[PDB]
Ligand binder design. Structure first.
Ligand SMILES: [Cl-]
Ligand SMILES: [Cl-]
Ligand SMILES: [K+]
Ligand SMILES: [K+]
Lengths: 358, 379, 358, 379
């Protein structure tokens, strides 16, 4: 799935054409297309958890907006396709506008219908069979949580209760016809697991940044690669977690073990759960892993290097302002303004010109 | 919920869903790596008594059609897939897979860990199995049937699929634009080839015809005598199910033809029969070769061809009589793929030159045959 | 189907609710719901010929209107439902907005699909089998003509060619379990005809006005009935053609033969075809039958009383003035204008105040 | 396109569409005027060897469901309708009509002028016919099958539909809230009734249970001796297909019961048998009674009930023995509807007090029965 950055180019024509406009791409592997597609959606780093809705069901103009988005593709087309199904458009109706083969469309439609059931039965309806079913289709704990109006952690926990965890398959070029000595893996919800983690080596996990985007380029990947090469050379067993198909970090050669998965809390915890690494590196992949720092630690993940709290102290303006202060360091005069007038006055205080960061 | 269950001789159970006929199915379980071509596979007589497992998860994407049938019926004992798509989406589709299975009365199961299954077969070799599709699939029962299966070793299946009576074939290959062409007039075909029906795929016939051959298909047990009497420009030994070894009749006839100068060409099974008839030895492979991405090197020319394979048995290369020369070997496993008689105009290939499904890389095997024929007629 | 008159109440709220706002109703009988429904639409006298579209397929906004019309029913909903299916909406989509049971909805979708095939194959594709399947579903020759791009009379002529005519069944209260000596019929495209017209009598056919509307009330029905009663009593065999369920004209006791059909040229002609009436009355049932006079007359139908020509002479603004002019009578000063600036000057001529009739 | 054709003895053809299984069906053709209740109708044993034509145009609007089966299977030999709706639309539905039909292997046709058929059957009387659903239905063949059918007159169908071995029935009626109940316990039902299965409908059973009757359902050919040996509170004579006249064994056994003081109650066929056992005569009607809107007068009380009817035969009123009094007559044709033994605790009804489908107006007929069995227990 390509990664775009239209939000950084306001006056730009944001419709897709023959000239590329994308700035990166994510890749996902699944036993099925649905599973594959959904994992890619959650791996895109756009905040989606899968088919998050774009228009309100109560919007009187919804079908008209949907239609345009469909008929004239932009970056969000994919989500609009799911909206169309929620709004009452048929597979033939969607086909006609998008020219996307019905073979794919029916699958998206089926996932929507599954979502309607989740919404209807709520967390209560989330029995083992149903949940397993949903997981097999690629649903993220986060997407199911939103549908059942609970926290993501609640869905995860439920999986833990049911002993509902994914298994890992390996990439091998030959559909299992021959064995592999490489550990290039992907998660799926199935029977047999091919992970066979070692008990031997002390392990270090390196979290990648997912798809490239403006501001989150190859620079961060170069770092992930060097962390892996160095620690491995040093004797550690190096495990890489990433899903960018264009990178050296996702080259099986780069590390001891490669999990080609979305860099998300849900996907990472599953890995950790079975690898039980000595440490996990979240500072090398950009914003993507950086934001999972707290939740990872909170789930008992062994995060190495600068603490998640430490990271926040630097990332939170306020926390940062104190530190500076405590340090007796110079920083531009600032001020959080709520209201407009509160702003025109504060501004006077600060003095012009002004750097308005929301 | 329409349950289906598959159980292997070893006790291993796979719980899934019914996608074909209600009932049971017992046979040798094999795995096939072909990403496309599931219909042609199913319609391959060589799959008789075998439960076929496809490694590619989505099976049925393009539905089915009559041009994609390799014979008059579904030969597979059963079908094991990971996922049956909600719809068939291809301009050529005439019936969705499930409907097609139901119609052919095939017991099929979907939604199982096919990769697990595949890895098991690879590691531990072929195993017999049973698929039970119905209300309450009894696992102990499945296990029973699987276990009771005789096995394909030493089992002659050629006799079971062979045509009752002889017949003529003069139809060529399908084209995108023309589809399946009308059968040709006998006068239109230069040569006359007599073909032993050991469970022949229609595409072999089609492709020979494309090459100027008018054919006469004969039962597997037809006598050389009866054959020589027809005055064939060439003799073709078809592909087919089971153990080639128990086919004394064919081996005997084949031997009779070899005393002659008539060109002989066999494919897969017919390749082993030729080998046997020449004094070679055949074995049953650990799991066999089933797929359409198999590298095969023509040792004389030193080139590689990607092929379609469908075989559970092989000809031993170390037992080859001196009159048999090795022309091709598998690049995946070095196993014997082709042989040519050093003294007679007889040769054969273990894979499928006619593909269907698969890469067209090996088609030229036929050409050699023709050449032999043309030169046999020059006399 | 109810008949409304919102156009006469421009400032009125036109959404359907629990307080009635319809002014009449039409009824129809068919051997299948599809047939019954289409017959009712063409008998409704609103100018519909079946599911004529309200919006255009190429309106970016069409979906917004369709959504609104479906969610909050007005008198036109039945039409928007078909527009909905032409626009890619599914049965469930429509269900969701309307709450109209899907059993009825699938039938409307089917008709649209068929209409799509007709538009597609055109007149040339209107082969006997297809033509017959269409008639069987209640399609009006006029609807088909619109779809094929031809005149209604072309379709009619074609039916004539394939000798494709309806048959008449009888209402008998008991599903044919008992014979009936009453002649209360309706048309259908079936096998056996139960009309059994007399060869006996001098027949007089009276045409009713369909559903009552403002201005076209019971007063017209009353005349129709009087004609029937009077002539029957005089010894003529009376034939009533009408489809207003509320009236006396449609009570079987009122005439010797009752055809409970839409008062349309198509339906009327099929009746005349087999009855071979001595005369037909078109002046009693109001605007409905009156608008049919010219065409009936052109088709060979024996129209009695004041000729369509003479009717036209009075109703034709020009013809009339001509005649008034001619008899030496007074009529107010008048003129035909086209342009505004035109009126203004003409007005000047005529003298305010004015009567501006569209 | 899936062709189907109906041909009557007389030669009349009805060309339509196949909506059930492919194949042929032959039997007596009848019409039923029920606008609802099709499933129940198909599953009624009384329709054995009868091709059923429904007068109401749209059949299958609410799909099908278990609760709606009046017997284990579909007894209608064929189904004739005007239109099969696009979908089934009802909360209770579990399988659409076509599917249910194919499921039960029923030959059915739609899309024919059912009005013409009915009028023909009414005007000219019942006829035998045959439906052929298949690729190219052979009118001539259908016609012979039609003509070769032996006719229901003089045909004992009860012996064909009854149960092999006897059995207990203790399950009550279905309800909207609860659905079909759970089988009561034997100590839960005061009375013990022996019910002769002449092809009995479940509802009759369910309704007796509701009245506190523990049931023992026996095979048609069960002896009186063998029944009396059960000391029953009462005996119940079921409903069933074909002619009652040829059921010697039952008329005889009943004859027996009539010697006793045990309470006897019959419905439809039972009614006829009871009459036979009292020396009355039976006749096959012109086209019979099949519908759920038939008015029946309780002559005793002068009141009308709207009833459910399904019978091709009737008891002749003028042949009626002094020991039989008329309790009911049809308001539609004057035919005999109910009778009572002057001398015995025995009575019956031609219609179906248990409806299913149809009006519940005649359910009270059941009470009379109980009253008897009760008074018979005081003694
Ligand atoms: Cl499994
Ligand atoms: Cl017909
Ligand atoms: K499974
Ligand atoms: K027909």
């Amino acid at each position: 799935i390509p990664r775009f950055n239209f939000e950084k180019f306001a006056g730009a024509n944001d419709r897709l054409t023959t000239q590329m406009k994308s700035v990166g791409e994510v890749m996902a592997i699944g036993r099925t297309q649905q599973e594959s597609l959904q994992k890619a959606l959650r791996g895109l780093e756009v905040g989606a958890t899968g088919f998050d809705p774009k228009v309100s069901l109560d919007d009187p103009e919804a079908l008209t907006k949907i239609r345009r988005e469909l008929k004239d593709a932009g970056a969000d087309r994919i989500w609009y396709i799911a909206d169309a199904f929620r709004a009452g458009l048929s597979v033939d109706g969607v086909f006609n506008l998008t020219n996307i083969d019905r073979w794919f469309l029916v699958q998206i439609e089926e996932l929507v219908r599954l979502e309607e059931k989740v919404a209807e039965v709520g967390i209560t309806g989330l029995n083992a069979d149903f949940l397993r079913q949903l997981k097999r289709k690629g649903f993220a704990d986060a997407r199911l949580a939103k549908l059942a109006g609970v926290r993501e952690a609640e869905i995860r926990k439920l999986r833990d209760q049911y002993d509902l965890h994914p298994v890992y398959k390996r990439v091998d070029t030959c559909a299992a016809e021959f064995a592999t000595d490489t550990a290039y893996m992907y998660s799926t919800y199935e029977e047999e697991c091919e992970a066979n983690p070692s008990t031997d080596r002390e392990k270090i996990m390196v979290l990648g940044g997912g798809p490239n985007r403006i501001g989150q380029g190859i620079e961060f990947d170069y770092c992930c690669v060097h962390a892996s090469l160095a620690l491995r050379e040093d004797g550690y067993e190096t495990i890489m977690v990433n899903c960018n198909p264009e990178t050296v970090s996702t080259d099986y050669d780069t590390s001891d073990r490669l999990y080609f998965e979305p860099v998300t809390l849900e996907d990472v915890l599953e890995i950790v759960r079975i690898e039980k690494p000595k440490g996990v590196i979240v500072q090398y992949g950009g914003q993507t892993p950086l934001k999972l720092a707290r939740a990872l630690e909170a789930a008992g993940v062994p995060v190495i290097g600068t603490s998640p709290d430490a990271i926040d102290r630097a990332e939170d303006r306020e926390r940062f302002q104190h530190a500076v202060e405590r340090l007796k360091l110079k920083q531009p005069a600032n001020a959080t303004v709520t209201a407009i007038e509160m702003a025109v006055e504060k501004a006077k205080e600060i003095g012009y010109p002004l750097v308005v960061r929301p | 919920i329409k349950s289906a269950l598959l159980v292997l001789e070893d006790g291993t159970q796979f719980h899934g869903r019914a996608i074909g006929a209600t009932g049971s199915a017992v046979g040798e379980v094999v795995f096939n790596t072909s990403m496309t071509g599931y219909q042609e596979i199913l319609t391959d007589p060589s799959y008789s008594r075998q439960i076929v497992t496809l490694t590619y998860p989505h099976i049925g994407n393009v539905g089915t059609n009559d041009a994609d049938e390799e014979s008059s019926q579904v030969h597979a004992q059963g079908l094991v897939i990971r996922d049956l798509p909600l719809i068939a989406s291809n301009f050529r589709n005439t019936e969705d897979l499930s409907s097609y299975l139901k119609r052919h009365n095939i017991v099929a199961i979907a939604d199982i860990d096919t990769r697990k299954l595949t890895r098991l077969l690879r590691e531990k070799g072929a195993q017999n199995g049973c698929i039970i599709a119905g209300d309450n699939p009894d696992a102990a029962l499945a296990l029973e049937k699987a276990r009771a299966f005789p096995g394909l070793n030493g089992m002659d299946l050629a006799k079971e699929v062979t045509t009752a009576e002889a017949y003529s074939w003069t139809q060529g290959s399908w084209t995108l634009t023309g589809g399946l062409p009308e059968a040709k007039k006998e006068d239109e075909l230069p040569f006359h080839v007599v073909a032993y029906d050991f469970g022949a795929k229609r595409n072999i016939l089609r492709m020979l015809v494309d090459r100027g051959c008018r054919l006469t298909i004969v039962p597997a047990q037809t006598s050389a005598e009866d054959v020589l009497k027809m005055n064939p420009d060439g003799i073709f030994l078809s592909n087919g199910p089971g153990d080639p070894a128990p086919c004394d009749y064919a081996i005997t006839a084949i031997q009779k033809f070899l005393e002659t100068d008539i060109p002989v060409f066999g494919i897969s099974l017919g390749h082993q029969l030729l080998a046997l008839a020449s004094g070679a030895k055949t074995v049953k492979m650990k799991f066999g070769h089933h797929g359409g991405n198999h590298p095969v090197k023509d040792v004389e020319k030193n080139v590689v061809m990607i092929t379609a394979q469908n075989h559970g048995f092989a000809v031993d290369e170390a037992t080859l009589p001196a009159n048999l020369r090795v022309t091709h070997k598998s690049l995946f496993d070095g196993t014997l793929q082709g042989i040519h008689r050093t003294d007679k105009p007889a040769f054969s290939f273990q894979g499928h030159p006619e593909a269907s499904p698969g890469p067209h890389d090996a088609a030229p095997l036929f050409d050699h045959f023709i050449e032999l024929i043309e030169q046999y007629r020059k006399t």
